[PDB]
UniProtKB/Swiss-Prot annotation, chain A:
SUPFAM superfamilies cross-referenced by the UniProt entry: SAICAR synthase-like
Domain PIPK: 7-312
Protein name: Phosphatidylinositol 5-phosphate 4-kinase type-2 beta
SS bond list: none
GO biological process, one term: 1-phosphatidyl-1D-myo-inositol 4,5-bisphosphate biosynthetic process
Species of provenance: Homo sapiens (Human)
Length: 313, 302
């Protein structure tokens, strides 16, 4: 039952301690009927000065700040995520890979800037309104928590989201789609490259999701990018991951010498199975990412939507 | 859901803090032994909330625990489970500075800076004594020492186990330590703390028998010899009497000796049927001869 908070770097130990602490505190606060405006301006701040005490894995001195915890608790709920699940994914064992996921591949933690935190604040009220109006059905990032860590006097901002990719299905290819950009030879020659727009058009990959799936997808994406434009946001990308059912079927047995393509929409919410009549058996993960940035954002909406339309069947 | 609702805000912080520290402690393993740094150690946390969780807590406060490994171990050596300790302090606000937990199981006393200094001066020898007598002792059982800062003003507290039964109403009180007696002022309260002389005037005796009295005396002698060997004085013996029959105006004169650890039933050959609670108190204010006179006083009462 004993959480040690052991991690490779002290900041991660503090991250685990902080999420554990704040979720436990959150469990003694009742759940409100609605959020009040003050809930959107609030924060929790704790400052720890231990001494000759509990130093095995944590620092003796550190600080942890959580932003709008009532709000992200509500978001967590509206996205179908249990607080106990959230805390466990972050604390049963250290996250891994600044860019991290929890041990269980369920959630992503990104280090971010002061400015990103500011923008998140400027948009949070309208974003929560959007999430609730669409019952959480959106390809936008699902923000579950925003925290600030101070260790060795250095502040570090982090934003927690749900992973776009399946937490079980191996992802075989990745694209970042938003002028004309392509993957550097440097990126092109690494373990799993983020292949930009130009490489996707060069390769001629299309995604065969089947009529009904494609339509629900495009309706959802149109609602979302129009929201982003109405918030005067741009430079956002659509993230795309390909899982090859048959290759996975092989490797889970090739390591064995030493359902297939089945997934849970309650967990892998951006996942989509390939059309029954498709060249190969694939699973796709597609969602919008990178929306805290702030040439025209209206034209951004229109161009982005036309491109993403022309990448599906 | 622990709301930490309390009578005065300092009590809310006490509840939050003991809750916090006991939960943190449950993620700290139990060491093979205590090390010297454990006797110099401390936990310190500082809270600045804002537009958040202000219903029952303050937005800004600070909480310090002294020697958490030691007091946790003491707790164990006194037969006290950490989760129980935490519940008694947090399931419901303490009551009536002098406090007990809602369930009347532990006493929370405000104490001075100097008292904290003294507790530190003695803690290692005291813990060693606790372990040497397997916790069977009449000395105060220190379960936790904490510093609270709320509105920038610090408040020190020591938690100990209660002398009296947490269920049985106690009917008369004597504080035995020269010549001290109860003032007309003190004499005119609901339960007076009647000092040494008035108990001898009243002519109440306590009939515990022989075997009971004998083992009791062995324990009292051990304790005061320890306190002398540490050059401590001005300590008092607290004694409370429960007269079952007055209570009659589920169980009568019934208690759990694992819980009311200082209780004793009266001898069959006794004036009335009584239950007695006896333990040493106020041992933080720093001749030896006090040991001998004190123990002699307590000798002639069985
Ligand atoms: N639109 C908006 N609304 C808010 N409600 C809000 N809140 C914070 N930001 C921004 O990010 C930083 C947050 O940490 P803060 O710097 O504020 O944290 P704090 O000031 O306590 O500590 P420091 O002074 O030791 O850094 C701020 O400086 C801002 O750049 C906010 N932006
Ligand atoms: N699997 C998965 N699930 C998520 N929820 C998720 N969210 C963000 N990524 C990552 O965002 C990174 C770029 O991040 P981006 O915002 O473009 O910032 P830059 O790196 O350009 O500064 C991409 O390479 C993705 O790996 C995610 N990956």
């Amino acid at each position: 039952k004993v959480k040690l908070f052991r991690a490779s770097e002290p900041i991660l130990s503090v991250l685990m301690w902080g999420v554990n602490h704040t979720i436990n505190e959150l469990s003694n606060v009742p759940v409100p009927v609605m959020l009040m405006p003050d809930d959107f301006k609030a924060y929790s701040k704790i400052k720890v000065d231990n001494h000759l005490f509990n130093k095995e894995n944590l620092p003796s001195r550190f600080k942890f700040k959580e932003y709008c915890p009532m709000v992200f608790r509500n978001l967590r709920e509206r996205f179908g995520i249990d607080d106990q699940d959230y805390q466990n994914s972050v604390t049963r064992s250290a996250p891994i890979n600044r860019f991290l996921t929890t041990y269980d591949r369920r959630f992503v933690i990104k280090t971010v800037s002061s400015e990103d935190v500011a923008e998140m604040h400027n948009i949070l009220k309208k974003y929560h309104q959007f999430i609730v109006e669409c019952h959480g059905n959106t390809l936008l990032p699902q923000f579950l928590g925003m925290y600030r860590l101070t260790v060795d006097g250095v502040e570090t901002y982090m934003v927690v989201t749900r992973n776009v990719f399946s937490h079980r299905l191996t992802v075989h290819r990745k694209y970042d789609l938003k002028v004309a950009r392509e993957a550097s030879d440097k990126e092109k020659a690494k373990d799993l490259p983020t292949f930009k727009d130009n490489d996707f058009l060069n390769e001629g990959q299309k995604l065969h999701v089947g009529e009904e799936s494609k339509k629900n997808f495009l309706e959802k994406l149109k609602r979302d990018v129009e929201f982003l434009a109405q918030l005067k946001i741009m430079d956002y990308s659509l993230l795309v991951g390909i899982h090859d059912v048959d290759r996975a079927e092989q490797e889970e047995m090739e390591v064995e010498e030493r359902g297939p393509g089945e997934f849970d929409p309650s967990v892998d919410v951006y996942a989509m199975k390939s059309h029954e009549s498709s060249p190969k058996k694939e699973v796709y993960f597609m969602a919008i990412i990178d929306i805290l940035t702030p040439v025209n954002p209206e034209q951004y909406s229109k161009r982005f939507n036309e491109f993403m339309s022309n990448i599906l069947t």
